[PDB]
Amino acid sequence: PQITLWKRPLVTIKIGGQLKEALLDTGADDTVIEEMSLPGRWKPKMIGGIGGFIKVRQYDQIIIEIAGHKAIGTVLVGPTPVNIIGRNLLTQIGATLNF
Amino acid sequence: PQITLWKRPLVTIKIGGQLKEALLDTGADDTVIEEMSLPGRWKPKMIGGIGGFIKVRQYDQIIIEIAGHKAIGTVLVGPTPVNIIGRNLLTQIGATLNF
Ligand SMILES: CC(C)(C)NC(=O)[C@@H]1C[C@@H]2CCCC[C@@H]2CN1C[C@@H](O)[C@H](Cc1ccccc1)NC(=O)[C@H](CC(N)=O)NC(=O)c1ccc2ccccc2n1
Numbered sequence: 118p119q120i121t122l123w124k125r126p127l128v129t130i131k132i133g134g135q136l137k138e139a140l141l142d143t144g145a146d147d148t149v150i151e152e153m154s155l156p157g158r159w160k161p162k163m164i165g166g167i168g169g170f171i172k173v174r175q176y177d178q179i180i181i182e183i184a185g186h187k188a189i190g191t192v193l194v195g196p197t198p199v200n201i202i203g204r205n206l207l208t209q210i211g212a213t214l215n216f
Numbered sequence: 217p218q219i220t221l222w223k224r225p226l227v228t229i230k231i232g233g234q235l236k237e238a239l240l241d242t243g244a245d246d247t248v249i250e251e252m253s254l255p256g257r258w259k260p261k262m263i264g265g266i267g268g269f270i271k272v273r274q275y276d277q278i279i280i281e282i283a284g285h286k287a288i289g290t291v292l293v294g295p296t297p298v299n300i301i302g303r304n305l306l307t308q309i310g311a312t313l314n315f
């Protein structure tokens with residue numbers, strides 16, 4: 118599978134039993150999802166990007182499916198305008214940047 | 217070359233005749249470089265990310281070298297925390313995401 122970048126590399130994910138669209142993002146350390154109820158324990162975190170920081174809820178050991186690939190890892194929930202799959206999960210689904 | 221994502225995908229770039237380090241970022245539509253003196257005509261623009269928008273200088277038709285590959289395109293210059301190479305130039309150097 119190879120994804121060119123003339124458009125946003127959006128894929129379908131399954132998280133908390135719901136389908137969402139998310140951006141495959143090699144520039145993001147972390148995976149950040151829009152506000153949603155997720156069951157289970159979490160802890161407060163702040164994460165930064167181009168316009169500054171947002172508060173998120175950090176959930177560890179979340180089961181997620183990304184474009185058909187299974188993953189288990191940390192998901193941050195908070196007011197991102199776009200759902201983002203960052204390197205912590207891109208490494209699990211085997212993504213590489215070929216240039 | 218193929219980049220795994222266990223670490224940040226940082227590469228050397230050449231802009232304005234100066235070497236810098238920048239992040240290869242499939243989640244960014246645009247290329248944003250830290251404040252620097254750069255010759256060329258520009259115009260103001262807002263660009264956004266997590267945390268909101270920042271004001272930048274939009275330079276069109278800038279010659280940039282990214283990991284040894286020459287590209288020409290729009291560069292935004294402003295108070296970004298990190299230099300980022302986004303899809304407008306990743307496509308020009310032929311970068312793909314594979315998995
Ligand atoms: C998600 C998080 C874990 C916080 N990581 C990061 O944000 C790190 C931070 C690094 C240090 C500072 C400079 C940016 C780098 C790159 N990144 C990721 C990097 O990939 C980040 C991910 C992202 C995408 C969409 C919207 C928000 C955020 N992209 C961006 O910050 C780019 C900047 C640009 N080109 O205009 N934003 C966008 O391309 C973009 C697209 C759609 C939008 C819709 C509404 C509002 C904003 C929107 N921004």
Ligand SMILES: [Cl-]
Nearest residue numbers: 152153154155
């Ligand atoms: Cl919900």
